């Protein structure tokens, strides 16, 4: 009522995410009750919008939150790995093996995998500020994320990270990384070649009264803010608003930021004194506005303190995507980080997949800076084949009942190379011997042989099966794999620990 019932739901979702991962991977369409259509290959976003009536399989749904908080990438790899571990364990259940040795078998092999990740690591090379290093991290995401164009998207991200880079060369001990430092804007129409990068951050709003530049003012000033008796309130407000707006114009403040409701009488004087105003800033825009500009949102409607004010070297309100838009565009010299990357595309759904792909690229820098390093792992399924030889060796080194769990734990690794063959329509049985041909019988006496040095890249080479991953720069994140086996083991043992569903007053 549970195991067989859950596996029926597992094989469903496992086959779904099987075609998501890989450069040949596929997307899916999800329609909610409101009619919203979302196309993405991410498993965390997929299961989030879907409504599942089976509480048993929901363990893998909530398990994605552990991966998104720790890393945010490799979500498709976790669902495929965790889903396969429960599929290969079905044979041990029919054999009569209790879950005691099954849970202990996965936990024993999990510690053995972490020991191999430190021995099998290569490509230290330890360079933060190189533009080529930013390309080596963002290129491999074409497997799990959108593979459409890796040439243009890799260049815009590398120029944006280097623009917001704190520098502080040698040892600067830089804390407080900015995840929000990268932002993209969806613009309907145009191709990807029309996209570019701006030193400042941009946003979608339209000017009304002035549209003038005003950035030529050579260190200008910007402010930030948080029957005759019937005319007593009317004339009373006209005298106060006039005096408050005049003192601002006397100080030479070209643009102000108003985060509250702006009346009709307020906008009347702004056109005469030539003062720009922002209309209804959101919550996430208000936090980015005060931190980058460095101005205090004084709630007083009067003249703000001229000592602390915002400054923008160069800003233009003219057209960008064909419509006039006022933006925050700036220059790194006199003002801080958090630039943006402007995207151009015809399909709005394709811009969403690029947004999720760039957001995962921010975690690549997080994985390098927060621990000692992100290191490297063989990409395109070349890491799993390295573990198959190690886990198989551990089965003979530890005789006992764990050999049945160790055997099924190594067989579960066959889904990763099958992913490349299934999504490409090629026979997995033809590519399988080409994968074993790298290590042959044993490893040659040379260091970093074709098993470690080369990998599986299938375009025209499907007959050969092996390709160098060094020139292709195809690698897997080490912090992701460490957290992948942790979430997969915790989620697999959780389903096996389920006994009976309990309903309380319903």
């Amino acid at each position: 009522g549970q195991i067989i019932k859950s596996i029926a739901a597992i094989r469903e979702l496992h086959q779904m995410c099987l075609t998501s991962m890989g450069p040949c991977g596929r997307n899916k369409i999800i329609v909610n009750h409101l009619g919203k259509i979302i196309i993405t290959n991410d498993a965390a976003t997929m299961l989030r919008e879907l409504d599942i009536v089976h509480p048993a399989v929901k363990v893998l749904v909530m398990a994605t939150e552990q991966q998104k908080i720790d890393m945010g990438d490799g979500t498709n790899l976790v669902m495929i790995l965790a889903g396969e571990l429960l599929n290969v364990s079905e044979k041990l259940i029919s054999m009569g093996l209790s879950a005691v040795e099954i849970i202990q078998g996965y936990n024993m092999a999990r510690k053995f995998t972490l020991k191999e990740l430190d021995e099998m690591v290569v490509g230290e090379i330890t360079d933060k500020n190189d533009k080529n290093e930013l390309l080596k991290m963002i290129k491999p995401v074409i497997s799990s994320k959108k593979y459409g164009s890796e040439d243009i998207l890799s260049e815009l991200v590398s120029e944006a990270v280097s623009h917001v880079l704190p520098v502080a060369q040698q040892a600067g001990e830089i804390p407080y990384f900015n995840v929000d430092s990268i932002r993209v804007v969806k613009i309907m129409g145009g191709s990807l070649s029309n996209s570019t990068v701006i030193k400042g951050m941009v946003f979608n709003r339209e000017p009304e009264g002035h549209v003038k530049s005003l950035s030529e003012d050579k260190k200008h000033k910007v402010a930030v803010f948080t029957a005759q008796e019937m005319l007593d309130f009317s004339k009373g407000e006209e005298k106060q608003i006039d005096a408050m707006m005049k003192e601002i114009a006397d100080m030479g403040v070209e643009c102000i930021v108003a985060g509250a409701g702006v009346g009709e009488l307020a906008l009347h004087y702004l056109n005469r004194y030539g003062i720009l105003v922002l209309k209804v800033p959101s919550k996430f825009e208000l936090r980015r506005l005060c931190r980058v500009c460095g101005a205090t949102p004084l709630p007083r409607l009067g003249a703000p303190t001229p000592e602390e004010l915002g400054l923008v070297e160069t800003v233009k309100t003219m057209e960008i995507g064909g419509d006039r838009v006022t933006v925050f565009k700036q220059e790194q010299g006199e003002i801080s980080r958090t630039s943006t990357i402007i995207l151009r595309g015809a399909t709005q759904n394709n811009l969403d997949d690029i947004e999720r792909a760039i957001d995962d690229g921010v975690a690549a820098v997080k994985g390098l800076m927060k621990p000692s390093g992100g290191k490297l792992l063989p990409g395109a399924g070349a890491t799993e084949i390295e573990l198959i030889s190690r886990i198989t060796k551990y089965g003979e080194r530890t005789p006992g009942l764990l050999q049945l769990a160790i055997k099924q734990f190594a067989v579960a690794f066959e889904v990763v190379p099958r992913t490349l063959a299934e999504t490409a329509g090629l026979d997995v049985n033809e590519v399988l011997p080409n994968l074993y041909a790298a290590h042959n019988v044993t490893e040659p006496g040379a260091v970093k042989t074709d098993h470690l040095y080369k990998g599986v890249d299938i375009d025209g080479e499907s007959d050969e099966g092996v390709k160098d991953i060094r020139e292709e720069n195809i690698y897997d994140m080490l912090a992701t794999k460490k957290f992948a086996i942790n979430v997969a083991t915790e989620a697999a043992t959780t389903v096996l620990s389920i006994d009976q569903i309990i309903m309380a007053k319903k």
């Binding site: 044979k91 054999m95 009569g96 093996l97 005789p399 006992g400 009942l401 050999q403 049945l404 997995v428 049985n429 033809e430 399988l432 011997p433 074993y436 019988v441």
Partner: protein, 380 residues
């Protein structure tokens, strides 16, 4: 239809094989059947089980003719060989209906498996001389341990071994043993027998006619042997032929294959551990369906563990380690489920027992894989 039709065929042989799992060994269990007519048949022999049951699955009907071929050779213990044909079908579930492995590729792997199996059969080969009557006496008594005629076999099995050697001799040694004529006399004691060398109807010793309610006695001197059996009961004559007339297969198998293999389901233990080692040297696409055959070989000895009330997972851990390391002469005790080796177990079976078992299993398994689907309603 297509792959879905083959799934019903795998479960058809799997459901039949699961019934005969407990039909092997001296601890073999029994099965009760209920027909729509209301008759009940309770027996431990799978021969009459497959004949009386009319199965709706067309794939299970092929196993009925296979049982007739296996029973034509020996018939005792060879009924459970069908399990091996059923385990291979269930072994293809991760491959055939999942990896989409082509059946001929599996059949080609079974061709290399059947060839490598005969090499393992020659590895456990233990020749023994047939001139010793005491060595051949304990050989025919192997199949007697499943019956209460054990202590009765002292005056029984000695008559069968002496009659076959007269009609066997040599030519190779191929000859016809069917010239023997066995006569059964109801009533009396089982210990009473008749020793007669000749033809029952030059310088003849004597001629006499005894007194028997059936017929008289006549002696014919030649220049051929008959057996007169006196049963200890009325209907016991049916079980006497099973322990003597049907026991002639042991005398036929020792002449064709003088070698001895571990008896009581202990032979395939050394075969499964050796087949896994031969798979690592293949290094090909077929290695996975070839190595998976060893997983189907270890399911047969689990029938003894299911009969001995043990744990097949934990017990076979030490058992498979003995055959793959210490020696291939080790075996499994079926009675108590113990590690006692076949050396002190005192029972050995000819190699042809497992030869014809694996040969007929692979030939029956490939034919089931060559069937794409099954259609009905042709109205022939």
């Amino acid at each position: 239809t297509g792959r879905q039709a083959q799934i019903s065929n795998i479960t058809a042989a799997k459901a039949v094989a699961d019934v005969i799992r407990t039909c092997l060994g001296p601890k073999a269990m029994l099965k009760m059947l209920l027909d729509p007519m209301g008759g009940l048949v309770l027996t431990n022999d799978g021969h009459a089980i497959l004949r009386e049951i009319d199965v709706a699955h067309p794939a299970a009907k092929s196993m009925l003719e296979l049982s007739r071929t296996q029973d034509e050779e020996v018939g005792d213990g060879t009924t459970t060989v069908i399990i091996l044909a059923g385990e291979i079908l269930a072994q293809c579930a991760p491959y055939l209906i999942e990896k989409n492995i082509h059946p001929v590729i599996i059949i080609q792997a079974l061709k290399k498996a059947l060839t490598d199996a005969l090499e393992v059969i020659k590895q456990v080969s233990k020749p023994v001389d047939v001139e010793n009557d005491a060595a051949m006496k304990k050989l025919i008594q192997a199949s007697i341990g499943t019956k209460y005629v054990i202590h009765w076999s002292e005056k029984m099995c000695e008559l069968a071994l002496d009659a076959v050697k007269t009609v066997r001799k040599d030519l190779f040694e191929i000859d016809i043993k069917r010239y023997v004529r066995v006569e059964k006399i109801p009533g009396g004691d089982v210990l009473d027998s008749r020793v007669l060398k000749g033809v029952l109807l030059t310088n003849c010793g004597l001629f006499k006619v005894e007194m028997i309610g059936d017929e008289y006695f006549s002696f014919l001197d030649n220049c051929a042997c008959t057996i007169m059996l006196r049963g200890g009961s009325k209907d016991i004559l049916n079980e006497i032929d099973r322990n003597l007339q049907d026991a002639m297969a042991v005398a036929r198998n020792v002449m064709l294959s003088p070698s001895l293999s571990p008896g009581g389901g202990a032979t395939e233990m050394a075969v499964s551990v050796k087949l896994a080692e031969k798979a690592k040297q293949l290094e090909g696409i077929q290695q996975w369906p070839y190595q998976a055959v060893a997983d189907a070989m270890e399911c047969i000895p689990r029938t003894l563990i299911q009969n001995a009330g043990g744990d097949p997972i934990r017990l076979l851990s030490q058992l498979r380690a003995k055959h793959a390391q210490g020696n291939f002469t080790t075996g499994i005790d079926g009675d108590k489920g113990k590690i006692v080796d076949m050396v002190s177990y005192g029972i050995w079976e000819p190699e042809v027992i497992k030869q014809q078992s694996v040969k007929t299993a692979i030939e029956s398994a490939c034919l089931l894989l060559r069937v794409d689907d099954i259609v009905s309603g042709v109205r022939k």
